[PDB]
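Q: A reviewer asked whether we had any structural model of the full assembly, not just the individual parts. We don't, so I'm hoping you can provide one. Inputs are below.
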Amino acid sequence: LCFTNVYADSFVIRGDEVRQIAPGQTGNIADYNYKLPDDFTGCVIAWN
Amino acid sequence: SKFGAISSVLNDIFSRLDPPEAEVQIDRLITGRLQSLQTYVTQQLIRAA
Amino acid sequence: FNATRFASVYAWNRKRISNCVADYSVLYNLAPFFTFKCYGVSPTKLND
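A: Here is a predicted structure for the entire assembly that you could use as a starting point for your response.
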């Protein structure tokens, strides 16, 4: 498939908090550091 | 009528659950209510005839 | 948290808590800098 434009965001987080990177999730990270839109499209790649 | 969903209270569905399956529940509610209204309209049309 | 003396590490106390309302925000006033590591739950969402 072809995409109109591509945005890449990179950071480093805690192991337990990796589940907070998802639309509709709540917590410290999902609220005060990084919020994803509910109708989000795209991928998340997280590795130790 | 819950229409097979977990609850019949729409704002409860919003508040108590995250969007992923809350969307499914709301879609089920909307489909059920729309079907009921359609059935009522058709029955009214027959009576009008 | 304000007890005069704590038990020794080997003979550590055990306290049960039930049927109460807890306001953990006050726990942020213990020291100017102190460890608050939390496992399996975000500290900012302990009031919900």
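A: Points you may want to mention in the reply: The CA atoms of residues 7 and 39 of chain B lie 23 Å apart. Chain B touches chain A at residues 18-20 (CB under 8 Å).
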